[model samples]
Target: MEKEFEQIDKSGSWAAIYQDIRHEASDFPCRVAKLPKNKNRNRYRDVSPFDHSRIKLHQEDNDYINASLIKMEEAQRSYILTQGPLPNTCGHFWEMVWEQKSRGVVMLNRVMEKGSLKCAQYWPQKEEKEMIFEDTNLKLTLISEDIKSYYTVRQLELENLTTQETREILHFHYTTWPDFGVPESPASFLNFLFKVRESGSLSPEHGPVVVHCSAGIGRSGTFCLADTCLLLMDKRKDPSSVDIKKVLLEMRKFRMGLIQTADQLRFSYLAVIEGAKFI
Candidate 1:
């Protein structure tokens, strides 16, 4: 990785590079409806799912959630990028997980951030170890919990109450990431990513792993892009061969406003570089 950057000066700014990518992305067509019919479905008015890639609930024809299914065939990975569920959409959130047969959920935000409610407390907590969603007829029970320095891993049992079927789902939450900023370092972030990879939830056999942040675009996009790029580099044994910018552009095709800031993009490159060493 250091060899590839020899020609580019370290002091050289990334402003031009950022601007160029932004200019190119601005022209890409992304005209999709926000699904205005449902008033309380989305947490933010500006954060909406693209019609082409939005996930739809099978049982209900009219209900919709602001989420997108991002598929990277070359990397053999898929992720459901969605916003933090609104209070009313918690049931629909679990319903999507059951219907999709998802093995895990990767949450990148907290229920509260900077004195604002970034997401609803959709999962079970202490004292309230289990909760039932009547709308979807799903029962979620906490099996175990493991807390880390900057992340938490929870073993959750999601059961279809009506059918009496149950599946174990892993919930990986990165607690230290600020709302719109990167983590303190790539080492901790990479460690968290490795933990998630070890679970085999991201494998092709299981449904797409659901990943969400506050808006489900900034932090969520960074995590997916870094994971994909590192996987490609490891598979090809050539870190320099993978084009990070190109991959980000392709991901934006599935959902708009991915990698919201240039800093996030820079941090992605840093994480991928650091992770490539281990690969």
Candidate 2:
């Protein structure tokens, strides 16, 4: 099974596989997300989380947030695939994280890209800088930061203003990943991915890790697919037993339009193949 990746690479079948994987974009309906009250909470009008898997903010009177909980039990993986929070939804974003007990947030895009705001300044960026979400009564403070050429790791403190309870959340920001394009290299992406894994934030002991990009589907999808495929490959006696196409299909069942482009899909294959070397 180990050689299947090499065989596929040798035959240049990755593109064909990508096309097959991208073939299905039609997903289930998101009735709640399309509601007038919830429409403004989404970063993109068309990208909505499926009703069945969409995260529901139970405590909040309005339970709508553009986030889906993708559970891949086979790989012991679960993720909250969410859009980059809008200005109005930042409070809800932190609320969802705190409620879900997510230890980390994987941000795949910059706050602004190509003169457009990809994601809101959802977390504090400066030491001692705190952003207060009055709506949810939560406060986010930046504790520490480590910036690299490709990614930046930030330690943030989330406080429930009402209860005065606090939790530290890791923010993994991939600054170099282009909009719809893969990272500069498979190894670099894997390096960043492993860095997140090393913290054990993606493990099952906690809630699902919160993963996001602009629309919450493209690079976000690539991140999960690669991580899941690698873990599945490592677990199986026959590493090739993991089928990238099928794994992605299963993920799409939870969130619509994951792995938006053929290039992004191809990058997933490259990342999985590159990741197998370590196992």
Candidate 3:
């Protein structure tokens, strides 16, 4: 007695339906407010404008994804390195740097779960070494060597290897030294980055860096951001170069405000603006 409900076909039927839906949705009471993109919002607001003396540093407690920054200077070279929590195994870290080129990133992340570490070490025994270095998806290289011993060996090589150019390393000690009162691993890590950049190995591009720990983020983030601020300050070419607002905004965009605590973020601004001369 009734015709089957055949779909109606028209030139702009989907568009008409979409418009009707939009009209119906618009009728319902709703409010849209646009929040300003927090471009370095963390840098400017995290530290009080009144206390222009110190920079806040150290934010995340543990785990970090590494971020790299590159910039050019007329007379000098500079760079910034940042670290954050572990990126998902599927390639989030590479995705962040999809457009960047000729940049180097060293992640100092460590395993949070002991079982995970055991599993990782165990799997290598079962499977033939995959020649993982060639895999572009995961750019990290795991080298097991004592930091102190590694430093000593590298120093010795400089004297004997006449053909090799003296290579410098940016050392970020994730933990505390004997005398330098123990701070959080992040702060200590930043201090190490500051020391290396001050020594002049960190340039806009080039150089192999070692980022490590149980998992590298805690110590690594501090080192990376410190290197970043140092690089920015050294390359102060543009009128607004190294602006607090701009850097923080960019930092958050890439690492999602991985800087974490307010104190840590504030310290970073202070370290960059004033220079981590104390460390």
Leading candidate by lDDT: 2
Comparing candidate 1 with candidate 2, which one achieves the higher lDDT? 2
Instruction: State the lDDT at 186 in candidate 2.
Output: 88
Deviation of model 2 at 199, angstroms = 0.7
Measured with C-alpha atoms, the lDDT of residue 229 in candidate 1 is 92
- lDDT of each prediction vs. the true structure? 0.82, 0.87, 0.32
Clash pairs for candidate 2: none
Which residue pairs in model 1 clash with each other? none
* Ranking, TM-score, top scorer first: 2, 1, 3
- Over the stretch 149-187, how does candidate 2's per-residue lDDT look in tens digits? 989999999999989999999999988886545665688
lDDT of 1 by residue, 112-153 (tens): 888899888998986366999998899999888999888999
Q: What is the TM-score of each candidate against the true structure?
A: 0.92, 0.93, 0.38
Off by over 4 Å in 1: 1-12, 26-33
Q: Single out the weakest 10-residue window by summed lDDT for candidate 3.
A: 151-160
Candidate 3: which stretches are off by over 4 Å?
Answer: 1-105, 113-144, 149-187, 194-202, 205-223, 237-243
| Candidate 1 structure, TM-score to reference | 0.92
- lDDT (0-100) at residue 177 of candidate 1? 86
